[PDB]
Structure formats: structure tokens, C-alpha cells
Amino acid sequence: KNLRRITRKIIHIIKKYG
């Protein structure tokens, strides 16, 4: 399904865009 693990990038962003 959609969001091919994107969840990872999601947390990354915050951890990157914190």
C-alpha cells in the first residue's frame, strides 16, 4: 500500500526538521 515505510522519513523529518 501507499506510504512505503515513509513512516521512517516522517520521523526523520522531525528528527531532521526538529
CA 7 – CA 1 distance, rounded (Å): 12
Grid coordinates representing 14 are 522531525
CA 10 – CA 4 distance, rounded (Å): 11
Grid coordinates representing 2 are 501507499
Triad 11, 17, 18: Cα angle to 5° = 80
Experimental method: NMR
DSSP 6: T
CA 11 – CA 9 distance, rounded (Å): 5
Exposure class string for 1-18: b at 16+ Cβ within 10 A, else e? eeeeeeeeeeeeeeeeee
Helices (H) and strands (E) in the chain, counts: 1, 0
Triad 7, 14, 16: Cα angle to 5° = 110
Q: For the chain, what's the residue count?
A: 18
CA 18 – CA 9 distance, rounded (Å): 13
